[PDB]
Each structure stands twice: as structure tokens, then as C-alpha cells.
Write a protein that binds this ligand. Structure first.
Ligand SMILES: O[C@@H]1[C@@H](O)[C@H](O[C@@H]2CO[C@@H](O)[C@H](O)[C@H]2O)OC[C@H]1O
Ligand SMILES: O[C@@H]1[C@@H](O)[C@H](O)OC[C@H]1O
Ligand code: NA
Length: 330
């Protein structure tokens, strides 16, 4: 690694380079992080269930540790995430009797959570994924069903962004989602964000999760999505990048190691992806990987539990993979 290029330095004039972490991986992958990234995202510890597990009970310890690490190394921090249909405790939507609360009560709870969380990290966290995955991933409907939407109504996103803006008007607020480059969904995300911005809602950027495969989405689809979203005038962040060795239809669990073909195609894939990101450096301001080395990735258990994936630029021994060389040479 002595003579190895540093990711954040290579892309210094293009965009920040980030990694998703947790207290455990910060220790396990500390040197890689210190040598390559200038942005950090909490993989799980800033989600609702990990910040306010019970009403009035805030558990900022783990998030504080992540922020402390980032700040001690002059790394930016992306806040993830405030309002999402997943990883949110049941108490949030229920009353004493266990029945669903009213619109006003849920809005009060949403405002309280957002205000408390955002104000704590004001000045240390420069952006927040305010709304995560609200758009439907299947069907002809625009929005995915969720307790937030059911109880409050379809304007729940407008409210979330306004509450977050009030809490920290200097933060960049994002709508974050996956499968963001498939045409049908791209148009739903575009329509949603355009509608919000047309109402003056403080949504400053779109977060493209980029949980991609070797084949999907195509480079043309990625280019089209970047251009489509950029045309709204918002900032773009690639937020949870990883390149899975398995396509959606591939649920094999017996592969103990990736084939030389997988490794080679992944290298080509990462080179093509970063070449495209660099081309759009004027609108993309940050590229965060959902991890940093293959010794830790949520793809080991998703969508198939108990297997192994090799989605990042560094291997399990923290050594650069062929993908690393193609990525930094664009
Ligand atoms: O440890 C896992 C996390 O890595 C995972 O993170 C999510 C990945 O999918 C994205 O769409 C989400 O935004 C991101 O939070 O969440 C589940 C957890 O078990
Ligand atoms: O659970 C979600 C999964 O269904 C999607 O494919 O990727 C993002 C995850 O959060
Ligand atoms: Na840029």
C-alpha cells in the first residue's frame, strides 16, 4: 500500500469518496478508511431504531463514536436516515392502546425525532437522507405503502423535509433510493422530486444508492438517470455503491470464491462506472461505497442469507483488487 494511490486524492477534483461503517468496522478497517476516504456514513446506527428505540429514549452512543472518528480524521459525514419504511420501531405509529396514532400525533413525533437528531449533529454532518425509498419498486403506483404514508397522508415527505430544514437550514437534504436507474422507477423518482421542488420544498439532492450488479443497470441507463436527475437542478450523491457478483436471479449459495471471470468483469464494470462518474463531475459531488473491503458487506446476507459476496475495491485481506486499478485510472 505504500505506493498505492489514495482514492480521495485521486478524485480530489471530482467528488468525495466515502464508506459506510459501524463502530466495529471502523476498528477492523481503520487503516483503509484513514488512507482512502473523506466521507463516512453510518451503515445502521443513525437509523430510527438505533437512535430512538423507545419514545423519549435516545441512544446516540454508537452514532457519536462514528462522528468522532470522522471528525478526528477531517472526514465529512452523511446522515442516514430519518424517515424510512424499514428499521423504525413499532412505538412510533402506535398509541397507548396499541392502535395507530393520528396524523397530527405522528407529525409531532416525526418533528421531535428529526429536530433532536439533526440538532445534535449540526455543524458536523453536512447532509441528511431525509426520506429513504418512498417510491414503489414495483407496480404502477408512485409510492410504496408505509405506516408513515398511511397515517399522515402523501404529504408526509413534504413535512419531513421542512422539519429537517428548520432543524439545520445549512444541511443538504436528500431523497435517497435504489434501482434508481431503471427507467420506470427513474421516472417516478424524477416526478416525485420535481413535484416537491415545484412546491418550494427544501430537497437539495437525490441520492443514488447504486446497489448494482455486473450487468444492471446498463451504462446508458446510468447516464440517462444522472442526466434526468441533474436536470432538476439538484446535487447528486452516489450513496451506497457496491457491485454484486450475483444478478437478481442468481441465488446460488455454494460459491466459495468469485471466478476469474467475475473478478475481471467487476474490474471492467468499476472502471466503466467511474469513467462515467468523472464525466459528470460537475453534478456528482460524492461517491460513497456501502463498505470498503470484502471482509464486510451486507450483500453476504442479502438478498440470500448465509453466503459470500465480493462487491468492493479491496479484498478480505484489505488488498486492492483488479477493480481498484481500473477505478483509479479513469
Ligand atoms: O446491515 C444492513 C445494512 O447494510 C442495510 O443498509 C441498507 C442497504 O439498502 C439500502 O437501500 C438502505 O438505504 C441501507 O440502509 O440495512 C439493513 C442492515 O441489516
Ligand atoms: O431491502 C432493500 C432491498 O429490497 C433493495 O433491493 O435494496 C435496498 C434494501 O434496503
Ligand atoms: Na463534483
Amino acid at each position: 500500500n505504500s505506493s498505492l494511490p489514495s482514492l480521495r486524492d485521486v478524485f480530489a477534483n471530482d467528488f468525495r469518496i466515502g464508506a459506510a461503517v459501524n463502530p466495529v468496522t471502523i476498528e477492523m478497517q481503520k487503516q483503509l478508511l484513514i488512507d482512502h476516504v473523506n466521507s463516512i456514513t453510518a451503515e445502521n446506527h443513525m437509523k430510527f431504531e438505533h437512535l430512538q428505540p423507545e419514545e423519549g429514549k435516545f441512544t446516540f452512543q454508537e452514532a457519536d463514536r462514528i462522528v468522532d472518528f470522522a471528525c478526528s480524521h477531517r472526514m465529512a459525514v452523511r446522515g442516514h436516515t430519518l424517515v424510512w419504511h424499514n428499521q423504525t420501531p413499532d412505538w412510533v405509529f402506535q398509541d397507548g392502546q396499541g392502535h395507530f396514532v393520528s396524523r397530527d400525533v405522528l407529525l409531532e413525533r416525526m418533528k421531535c425525532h428529526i429536530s433532536t437528531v439533526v440538532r445534535r449533529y449540526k455543524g458536523k454532518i453536512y447532509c441528511w437522507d431525509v426520506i429513504n425509498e418512498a417510491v414503489a419498486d414495483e407496480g404502477n403506483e408512485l409510492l410504496r405503502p408505509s405506516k408513515w404514508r398511511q397515517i399522515i397522508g402523501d404529504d408526509f415527505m413534504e413535512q419531513a423535509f421542512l422539519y429537517a430544514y428548520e432543524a439545520d437550514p445549512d444541511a443538504l437534504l436528500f431523497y435517497n433510493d435504489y434501482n434508481e436507474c431503471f427507467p420506470e422507477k427513474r421516472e417516478k423518482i424524477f416526478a416525485l422530486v420535481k413535484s416537491l421542488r415545484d412546491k418550494g420544498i427544501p430537497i437539495h439532492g437525490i441520492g443514488m444508492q447504486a446497489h448494482w450488479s455486473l450487468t444492471r443497470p446498463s451504462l446508458d441507463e446510468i447516464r440517462a438517470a444522472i442526466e434526468r436527475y441533474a436536470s432538476l437542478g439538484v446535487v447528486l450523491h452516489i450513496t451506497e455503491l457496491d457491485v454484486s457478483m450475483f444478478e437478481f436471479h442468481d441465488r446460488r449459495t455454494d460459491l466459495a470464491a468469485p471466478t476469474s471471470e467475475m473478478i475481471e468483469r467487476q474490474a471492467e464494470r468499476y472502471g466503466q462506472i467511474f469513467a462515467l462518474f468523472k464525466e459528470y463531475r460537475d453534478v456528482i459531488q460524492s461517491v460513497t461505497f456501502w463498505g470498503i473491503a470484502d471482509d464486510h458487506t451486507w450483500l453476504d446476507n442479502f438478498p440470500v442469507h448465509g453466503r459470500k459476496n465480493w462487491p468492493l475495491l479491496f479484498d478480505e485481506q484489505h488488498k486492492p483488487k483488479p477493480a481498484f486499478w481500473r477505478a483509479v485510472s479513469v
